[PDB]
Design a binder for this molecule. Sequence first.
Ligand SMILES: [Mg+2]
Ligand SMILES: [Mg+2]
Ligand SMILES: [Mg+2]
Ligand SMILES: [Mg+2]
Ligand SMILES: [Mg+2]
Ligand SMILES: [Mg+2]
Ligand SMILES: [Mg+2]
Ligand SMILES: [Mg+2]
Ligand SMILES: [Mg+2]
Ligand SMILES: [Mg+2]
Ligand SMILES: [Mg+2]
Ligand SMILES: [Mg+2]
Ligand SMILES: [Mg+2]
Ligand SMILES: [Mg+2]
Ligand SMILES: [Mg+2]
Ligand SMILES: [Mg+2]
Ligand SMILES: [Mg+2]
Ligand SMILES: [Mg+2]
Ligand SMILES: [Mg+2]
Ligand SMILES: [Mg+2]
Ligand SMILES: [Mg+2]
Ligand SMILES: [Mg+2]
Ligand SMILES: [Mg+2]
Ligand SMILES: [Mg+2]
Ligand SMILES: [Mg+2]
Ligand SMILES: [Mg+2]
Ligand SMILES: [Mg+2]
Ligand SMILES: [Mg+2]
Ligand SMILES: [Mg+2]
Ligand SMILES: [Mg+2]
Ligand SMILES: [Mg+2]
Ligand SMILES: [Mg+2]
Ligand SMILES: [Mg+2]
Ligand SMILES: [Mg+2]
Ligand SMILES: [Mg+2]
Ligand SMILES: [Mg+2]
Ligand SMILES: [Mg+2]
Ligand SMILES: [Mg+2]
Ligand SMILES: [Mg+2]
Ligand SMILES: [Mg+2]
Ligand SMILES: [Mg+2]
Ligand SMILES: [Mg+2]
Ligand SMILES: [Mg+2]
Ligand SMILES: [Mg+2]
Ligand SMILES: [Mg+2]
Ligand SMILES: [Mg+2]
Ligand SMILES: [Mg+2]
Ligand SMILES: [Zn+2]
Lengths: 117, 272, 63, 87, 95
Amino acid sequence: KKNVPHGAAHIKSTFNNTIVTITDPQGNVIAWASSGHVGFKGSRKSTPFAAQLAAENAARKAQDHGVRKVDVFVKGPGSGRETAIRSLQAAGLEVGAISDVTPQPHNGVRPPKRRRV
Amino acid sequence: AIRKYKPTTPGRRGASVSDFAEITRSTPEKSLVRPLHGRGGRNAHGRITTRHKGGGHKRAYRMIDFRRNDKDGVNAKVAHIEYDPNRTARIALLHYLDGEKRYIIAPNGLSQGDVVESGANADIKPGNNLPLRNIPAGTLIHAVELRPGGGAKLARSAGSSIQLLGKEASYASLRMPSGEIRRVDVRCRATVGEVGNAEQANINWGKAGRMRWKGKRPSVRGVVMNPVDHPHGGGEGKTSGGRHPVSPWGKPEGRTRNANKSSNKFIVRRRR
Amino acid sequence: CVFCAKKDQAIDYKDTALLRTYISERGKIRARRVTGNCVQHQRDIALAVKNAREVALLPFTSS
Amino acid sequence: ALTAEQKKEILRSYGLHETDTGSPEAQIALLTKRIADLTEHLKVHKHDHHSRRGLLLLVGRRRRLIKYISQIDVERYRSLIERLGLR
Amino acid sequence: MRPYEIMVILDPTLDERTVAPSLETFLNVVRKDGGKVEKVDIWGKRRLAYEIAKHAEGIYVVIDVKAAPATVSELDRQLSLNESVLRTKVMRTDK
RNA sequence: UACUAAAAACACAGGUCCGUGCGAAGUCGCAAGACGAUGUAUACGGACUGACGCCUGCCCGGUGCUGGAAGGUUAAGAGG
RNA sequence: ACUGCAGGGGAGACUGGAAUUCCUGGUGUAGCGGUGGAAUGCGCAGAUAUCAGGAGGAACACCGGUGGCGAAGGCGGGUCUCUGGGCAGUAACUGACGCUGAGGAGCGAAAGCGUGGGGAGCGAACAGGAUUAGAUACCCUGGUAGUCCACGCCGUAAACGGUGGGUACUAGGUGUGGGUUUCCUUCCUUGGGAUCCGUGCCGUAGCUAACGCAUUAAGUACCCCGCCUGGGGAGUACGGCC
Ligand SMILES: [Mg+2]
Ligand SMILES: [Mg+2]
Ligand SMILES: [Mg+2]
Ligand SMILES: [Mg+2]
Ligand SMILES: [Mg+2]
Ligand SMILES: [Mg+2]
Ligand SMILES: [Mg+2]
Ligand SMILES: [Mg+2]
Ligand SMILES: [Mg+2]
Ligand SMILES: [Mg+2]
Ligand SMILES: [Mg+2]
Ligand SMILES: [Mg+2]
Ligand SMILES: [Mg+2]
Ligand SMILES: [Mg+2]
Ligand SMILES: [Mg+2]
Ligand SMILES: [Mg+2]
Ligand SMILES: [Mg+2]
Ligand SMILES: [Mg+2]
Ligand SMILES: [Mg+2]
Ligand SMILES: [Mg+2]
Ligand SMILES: [Mg+2]
Ligand SMILES: [Mg+2]
Ligand SMILES: [Mg+2]
Ligand SMILES: [Mg+2]
Ligand SMILES: [Mg+2]
Ligand SMILES: [Mg+2]
Ligand SMILES: [Mg+2]
Ligand SMILES: [Mg+2]
Ligand SMILES: [Mg+2]
Ligand SMILES: [Mg+2]
Ligand SMILES: [Mg+2]
Ligand SMILES: [Mg+2]
Ligand SMILES: [Mg+2]
Ligand SMILES: [Mg+2]
Ligand SMILES: [Mg+2]
Ligand SMILES: [Mg+2]
Ligand SMILES: [Mg+2]
Ligand SMILES: [Mg+2]
Ligand SMILES: [Mg+2]
Ligand SMILES: [Mg+2]
Ligand SMILES: [Mg+2]
Ligand SMILES: [Mg+2]
Ligand SMILES: [Mg+2]
Ligand SMILES: [Mg+2]
Ligand SMILES: [Mg+2]
Ligand SMILES: [Mg+2]
Ligand SMILES: [Mg+2]
Ligand SMILES: [Zn+2]
């Protein structure tokens, strides 16, 4: 029962999931619908279809709560970034500027050991 | 720092002793010494209330100035560093420019002949005493007091220090030697620097006699008593105590701090 | 190397107007081969950029 | 270190004829000065092995020059020994 | 006796007109120690590339002290001790 | 172990764990007050082990201790 | 010796940003994480995600390279202090004072040991899940010492250029680094030419069983030290030193 005409959209697209949360410009989440939140489980949560449908769910929840336009911050080496962007665009929301906010450590924390599979 | 004895006797085999390299003037100041006598851990009723006390070497008390309130703006010169049998740190004798002598806890790096200031305008140097409002955050301080004018009470043992985390409105957050975060009023006074003699914890007393000199009497385990004496007593051979560990008066292990003490509102985070 | 060409040129970390060059739009120090400088002048430029970032005349991470 | 005038002072103190720099006497004097300075520095920074190696090299060079001057002129060797220091 | 150049960053809360008398004492300590001050040009209010101590603005001063290393170290320690100084950086003009 | 047991028993220096932020914890006392300590976590108290050397494996199901509060159950009071 | 030159050579002290984790509070609800697929695991007692603030340790993206330095091992966030070595130029000075070096001494990756501190992340051991006939592994979830600091110890690596140190000589071609030098000196070109010190590649003769080396030799000679006499047993036994 709020009204936030402008807000922010955060998409976290990783190799195992895709989280699409929509916040006000101060960063307070209004909706957070995810690939697991929509019907999906297992490794299918990282599929582009799952990411795009999660974007649809987030966009419709934002429309219900009263959001008309949001900027998009994306991060993670996921493949659902562009599909989520297109769904957010042509699902009744305007994206505006697209920015990448992926963290970049200046040689900080040591990564885990390489996979010997 | 620490001098190791040679294994000339079984009692000396592994022992060590301070070299006392920081000490000058091996005698105290006659006008700042008060008498002391032992108690053996007995209270006004004449009954043992603390066990394992007694014997011990004779001692005399040296008046330590734990307030440092009335000499603001008056400089002092460090005249001597002396041994003190009543604490683990060393003490420094101060000659004030007004003609008065005082004893303070010797901080780390306060060699003889230095100048010590006090008050809000004092510089941030080891030995300078200031109210917490004038000490910048992140400093290492010691001899802090709980109430304004109450006298230093925290971080007084050898090697102790307190980190001033920050001052919020009228309270200062302190990281205390145990690791507990606490808030005290910004008007409380503190001394800049760390307490000296930090290596005394590595001293290896070699024999029972040395602790008898230091005034510590033998301690008997509960599992070798009779059940009329201790809850752990009894058994045919040696046992582990027939129950969960308890005190000699039957109290189980666990927190003993009062659960609703008035000071709970001043403690930010309990120690690990 | 423009500094080798035009000799007697002061390279300073406070010279933010000159140091704006040799950095990308994201605050990335430009490559030596891209700038065309020699090794010594490239190292001096990098040191000046680092000092400027330390004294907050240039941003560490630009977004 | 051994700045210009610092070198010149020892050079005129231990030289042969008002301009000598490469004689065993002047070389040994300068090496002794460098060795003393390096050891005094090494009382601090006890883990400066890269400079302790240079100090050892200087010690070896001075020892070789001392041996040469001792073999070539016993009187000059004794004079330099009393003027600088041995054992 | 070496030539130094020190840049000091002050909090924006202080006004830009009384800045010189405040650091005159930090110059006079060097003066007594036996150093000479070349130029104390003040850049005034400027924007920082990022927030420092929750401040988006600061005051820039170039001190340019030519004094002994121990004296310069003492001056830097005093500047860091002072709570109105946000950043301090000392570099040698020569090698 | 005065008066049948002097020892492998107790203590011990060293070790670990637990408690204690300060008229602390603990103890004596109905309380005031006291010891702890004219000490302040490198300090004090409790428990076990017992110079030194090499080490100290698996189990948190039970019972304790520490922490949490979604749900069930539950006193006086309120209500009537 | 004097004048210049380049450098992650080294030690100490102070200090900066990114990122991870953790803590507190706000927004907020049913998933999060993980894989080839999953499950163990985390959340619903309010997690993942988002914002703001704080705490803490480790490592210093871009520069950054085929590059530089160092006897080797190794060496770059920044600033300051102290200090080592090398190269170039003049020939200013001494006058064979040189080379190698049995033993001996010092330095010496990582792992490990002792004492105190520290511990974000990773991570032997260990535990659970998964694969498989079995899985004491590869994969996943965790997680202790350790990795970090201070002072010591240990002296071992495919510690490799699988090539000991020094010197003299033996076509060239083409990159890079530090200098100097006249000329083409404005042909602006910071290019070409000459010399010194290196660092790569290709290539003449010569050598080699071949692969290959080839002015940075494994070519032509000299001086010094170290090492081998078939493969296992074995770099092990005994003795001795630490
Ligand atoms: Mg009585
Ligand atoms: Mg006791
Ligand atoms: Mg006992
Ligand atoms: Mg008995
Ligand atoms: Mg009895
Ligand atoms: Mg009983
Ligand atoms: Mg028994
Ligand atoms: Mg039995
Ligand atoms: Mg037991
Ligand atoms: Mg029992
Ligand atoms: Mg008897
Ligand atoms: Mg008998
Ligand atoms: Mg007997
Ligand atoms: Mg007995
Ligand atoms: Mg009590
Ligand atoms: Mg404890
Ligand atoms: Mg126990
Ligand atoms: Mg026993
Ligand atoms: Mg004990
Ligand atoms: Mg159990
Ligand atoms: Mg249990
Ligand atoms: Mg359990
Ligand atoms: Mg409970
Ligand atoms: Mg160090
Ligand atoms: Mg943590
Ligand atoms: Mg939250
Ligand atoms: Mg969060
Ligand atoms: Mg001659
Ligand atoms: Mg040799
Ligand atoms: Mg040898
Ligand atoms: Mg190691
Ligand atoms: Mg260790
Ligand atoms: Mg340890
Ligand atoms: Mg298992
Ligand atoms: Mg693993
Ligand atoms: Mg892990
Ligand atoms: Mg071990
Ligand atoms: Mg060694
Ligand atoms: Mg190597
Ligand atoms: Mg050979
Ligand atoms: Mg050779
Ligand atoms: Mg050769
Ligand atoms: Mg070449
Ligand atoms: Mg070739
Ligand atoms: Mg061959
Ligand atoms: Mg052997
Ligand atoms: Mg043997
Ligand atoms: Zn250049």
